[PDB]
Amino acid sequence: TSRRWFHPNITGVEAENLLLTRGVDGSFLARPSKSNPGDFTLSVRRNGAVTHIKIQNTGDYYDLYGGEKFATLAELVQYYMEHHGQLKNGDVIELKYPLNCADPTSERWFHGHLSGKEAEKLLTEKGKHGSFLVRESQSHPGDFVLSVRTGDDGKSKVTHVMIRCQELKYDVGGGERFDSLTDLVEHYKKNPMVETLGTVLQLKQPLNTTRINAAEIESRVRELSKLAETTDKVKQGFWEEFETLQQQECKLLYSRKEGQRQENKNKNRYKNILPFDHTRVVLHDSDYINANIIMPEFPKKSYIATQGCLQNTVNDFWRMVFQENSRVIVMTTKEVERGKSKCVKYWPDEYALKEYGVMRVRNVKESAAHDYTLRELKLSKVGQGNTERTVWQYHFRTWPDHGVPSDPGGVLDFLEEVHHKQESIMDAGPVVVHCSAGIGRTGTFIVIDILIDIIREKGVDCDIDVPKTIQMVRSQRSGMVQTEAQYRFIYMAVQHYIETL
Ligand SMILES: C[C@H](O)c1nc2c(N3CCCc4ncccc43)n[nH]c2nc1N1CCC2(CC1)Cc1ccccc1[C@H]2N
């Protein structure tokens, strides 16, 4: 796995020159857009020239101009490198050779202008055996410092290794010279440095600097929100956390074979946004629906993340709800936004009874609120009177067309009622959550609920780790939490929750 074709800090011109001077026809890279922040650009060399293709993401998916919609940039690159997905005035565009980035900004172990002292404190307080980090050197500009903790009262220690930058290559004073910090770290991960008297300088795991005490979320958000005036002050902020998270998505390219099978193509709202095989909901008693089980310790504490129903998947949706014993549905989209259908009406009108295949649904009563509408539904299997159970649909209607709400209070009030309903139902199955593609808004809601539930169970003095939780959810459905705006909104929502306690 590798995501080195993503260059986080280049301009369009620098991208052009890199491709023309260091690449060949078929070379490609991706980068964040500096003209329209929040978007991305895929730049590809072919026939001695560079083509730029815009990628847009407002919170639901990566929309490649002239191409398809994708759950992550890694899934997008893999699709066209493997599949052609024919990316294409007619001509074809080939992604042949990733043009690799040497910038370490988004490595989990790189901390930029961290001082050797700030670094010593973090290693002693939060470090364990094998924790390591890399930082720029103050005393020797251009060089770096690798610090490792090893141990089990003097049973553990920290060791500092100087990394020299000599005519564009990096070394630790002897042996091989590498073209980038990443190449050097990976080498000494596989081939550990060994001290004079036997100590192995094992690079076991990057030092954790994202886990926080929930009670201090306010000061942490203040810290993460800081805007560096110069690059001297560029330190760990929201953007650094998020793009370091995004770099880890190449580890999550799990198989989605079932959703690509012939008989399942038209059950997917978006052709290339598909459920992982190893967590998809399998329908027993066709077995396919575009949905995944999300567990916060990867039933009553679990979720189902799914897409907005299509007219030909409504019956399968209710088979899933019934089979999994779900009693609560969270829908975070209108039926239609920006003139386009996001989810078909899969519930009966108020007071009406409808049959969906072998499933029967009655809309007992609707209750309208400021931000959302609650629909009380009774689901039964035709021919089995004893199977009736109430299903509570919480339909949040005011999520903005693009981006995230300006204030998390309405979402948190909505989320609180959802949680209370679920908890009052004995033996309730997983909560169903869906938007359009079921990864963006859906991922944001589920992660917030997971984080708040830790505070519920352990109190405000507990540890939470936003990126850690997201990566775990992203291992069960592709691209859960789509954008930096949503990443920030998750922090803002946990902060708002704590302040109202
Ligand atoms: C290892 C560290 O704690 C971390 N971790 C993740 C993280 N993940 C995803 C994978 C699984 C997972 N598991 C458990 C916890 C976190 C995570 N996502 N973003 C993360 N960001 C992190 N820091 C902030 C960003 C920099 C590294 C440190 C620190 C820094 C200073 C200046 C300039 C640039 C940068 C970033 N280079």
Side-chain angles (χ1 to χ4, degrees):
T1 84
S2 160
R3 210 173 170 262
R4 311 193 59 185
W5 39 261
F6 187 79
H7 297 241
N9 291 126
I10 57 188
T11 73
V13 166
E14 303 175 321
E16 252 156 36
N17 302 331
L18 264 167
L19 287 176
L20 285 184
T21 71
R22 292 199 22 223
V24 292
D25 286 5
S27 286
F28 73 88
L29 60 75
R31 72 217 170 67
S33 266
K34 264 162 182 170
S35 65
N36 207 320
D39 292 331
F40 307 83
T41 295
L42 176 67
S43 311
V44 184
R45 173 167 167 179
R46 81 184 290 100
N47 306 310
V50 179
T51 303
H52 297 282
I53 317 181
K54 183 54 73 223
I55 300 167
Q56 171 192 120
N57 194 330
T58 53
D60 313 314
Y61 41 62
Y62 291 87
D63 182 354
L64 178 63
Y65 173 89
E68 305 282 359
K69 289 170 185 65
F70 293 89
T72 80
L73 289 175
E75 292 194 350
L76 179 168
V77 166
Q78 178 173 75
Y79 176 88
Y80 290 114
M81 279 187 69
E82 295 183 327
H83 307 41
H84 297 298
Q86 276 314 130
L87 187 66
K88 351 182 172 73
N89 60 346
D91 307 292
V92 172
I93 287 141
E94 298 134 296
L95 310 188
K96 275 182 171 162
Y97 311 99
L99 193 156
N100 290 338
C101 185
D103 192 338
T105 307
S106 294
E107 295 287 353
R108 291 186 293 151
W109 38 262
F110 185 76
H111 291 257
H113 179 64
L114 192 72
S115 72
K117 172 27 56 172
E118 289 172 307
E120 199 104 338
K121 169 207 217 143
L122 293 167
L123 273 174
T124 48
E125 277 167 5
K126 307 188 246 178
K128 57 179 175 188
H129 169 82
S131 307
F132 66 102
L133 64 81
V134 177
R135 73 187 175 81
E136 291 164 354
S137 178
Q138 309 273 60
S139 42
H140 310 315
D143 294 359
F144 300 83
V145 177
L146 159 69
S147 314
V148 195
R149 183 171 163 154
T150 58
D152 214 299
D153 64 330
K155 260 158 208 133
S156 306
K157 64 161 181 169
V158 179
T159 300
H160 306 288
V161 174
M162 293 186 301
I163 297 176
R164 305 201 47 201
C165 184
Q166 314 198 58
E167 268 209 287
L168 314 206
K169 295 198 197 303
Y170 306 92
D171 66 78
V172 302
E176 304 290 305
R177 293 176 55 233
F178 304 92
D179 300 321
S180 62
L181 279 185
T182 303
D183 285 355
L184 172 146
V185 170
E186 281 315 314
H187 179 275
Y188 288 123
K189 262 151 81 169
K190 308 310 182 183
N191 312 274
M193 296 171 276
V194 189
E195 289 182 317
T196 171
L197 297 168
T199 292
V200 193
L201 297 185
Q202 181 189 12
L203 312 183
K204 173 177 176 172
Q205 66 275 311
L207 180 69
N208 183 296
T209 58
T210 50
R211 169 175 66 250
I212 66 179
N213 201 276
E216 319 191 329
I217 179 65
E218 199 191 302
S219 39
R220 158 97 308 181
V221 164
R222 193 153 29 221
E223 184 56 41
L224 295 173
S225 303
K226 278 190 226 134
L227 286 161
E229 289 168 43
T230 60
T231 70
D232 278 19
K233 309 176 170 186
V234 148
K235 68 182 127 173
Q236 176 176 336
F238 283 122
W239 184 96
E240 292 73 19
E241 281 195 8
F242 185 68
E243 289 302 332
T244 294
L245 168 70
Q246 299 303 78
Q247 176 173 301
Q248 297 293 307
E249 67 179 21
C250 58
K251 300 188 171 151
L252 314 178
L253 294 172
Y254 303 127
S255 61
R256 302 153 313 133
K257 302 231 154 293
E258 286 307 308
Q260 303 168 273
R261 291 162 56 91
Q262 201 33 228
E263 62 266 33
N264 292 337
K265 260 135 64 153
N266 65 11
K267 301 169 185 166
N268 300 310
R269 179 166 284 275
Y270 304 103
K271 99 167 271 283
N272 303 106
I273 300 177
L274 299 177
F276 292 140
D277 289 327
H278 76 293
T279 53
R280 79 183 179 101
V281 182
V282 186
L283 304 173
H284 302 272
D285 286 325
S286 50
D287 76 0
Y288 179 84
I289 179 158
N290 191 325
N292 299 86
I293 298 287
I294 312 294
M295 302 186 198
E297 331 92 332
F298 187 72
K300 211 198 173 162
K301 298 299 275 190
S302 291
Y303 314 82
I304 291 166
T306 196
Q307 66 177 23
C309 288
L310 306 151
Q311 299 280 32
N312 65 313
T313 69
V314 167
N315 293 3
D316 301 321
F317 178 88
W318 286 114
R319 283 167 67 207
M320 171 180 69
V321 174
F322 185 88
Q323 177 189 288
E324 301 296 308
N325 196 25
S326 299
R327 309 297 180 88
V328 186
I329 296 164
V330 177
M331 152 193 202
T332 62
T333 174
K334 300 198 183 64
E335 291 180 42
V336 168
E337 300 179 359
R338 282 186 30 228
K340 342 174 295 311
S341 182
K342 302 296 167 178
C343 182
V344 305
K345 189 166 165 284
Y346 58 88
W347 60 93
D349 298 340
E350 181 173 41
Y351 307 122
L353 178 77
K354 281 199 91 133
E355 298 188 346
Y356 302 97
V358 317
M359 291 301 156
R360 182 177 284 138
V361 179
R362 180 183 301 274
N363 180 343
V364 173
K365 183 94 190 63
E366 305 192 352
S367 312
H370 182 269
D371 286 302
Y372 73 90
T373 295
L374 169 64
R375 301 198 182 84
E376 177 177 356
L377 317 174
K378 309 270 173 293
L379 174 73
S380 51
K381 211 198 244 223
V382 188
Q384 304 289 21
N386 236 44
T387 64
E388 194 167 40
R389 81 288 311 286
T390 306
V391 176
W392 303 89
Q393 186 210 35
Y394 286 85
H395 183 182
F396 192 92
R397 290 217 109 241
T398 68
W399 199 289
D401 280 0
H402 293 168
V404 301
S406 55
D407 182 81
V411 163
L412 283 164
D413 295 339
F414 168 86
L415 183 152
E416 191 74 13
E417 189 68 22
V418 168
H419 191 275
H420 286 335
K421 178 74 59 166
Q422 171 73 0
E423 196 188 335
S424 66
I425 299 166
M426 192 63 91
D427 315 309
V431 172
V432 179
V433 185
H434 74 91
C435 48
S436 52
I439 61 184
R441 299 177 191 175
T442 288
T444 303
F445 177 93
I446 286 176
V447 172
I448 296 172
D449 196 60
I450 291 170
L451 293 165
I452 291 177
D453 201 50
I454 301 172
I455 303 168
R456 294 188 200 277
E457 202 80 5
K458 310 206 82 83
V460 284
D461 291 348
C462 64
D463 291 332
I464 62 166
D465 189 341
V466 174
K468 183 198 190 43
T469 294
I470 293 172
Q471 182 77 349
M472 182 258 255
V473 170
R474 288 177 171 184
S475 69
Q476 313 178 64
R477 188 154 168 95
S478 315
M480 288 277 276
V481 188
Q482 277 289 292
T483 64
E484 193 205 344
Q486 297 169 343
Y487 190 80
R488 291 169 173 261
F489 184 80
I490 300 173
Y491 272 99
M492 297 304 137
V494 176
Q495 174 186 232
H496 192 279
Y497 175 84
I498 285 149
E499 142 71 47
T500 73
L501 274 181

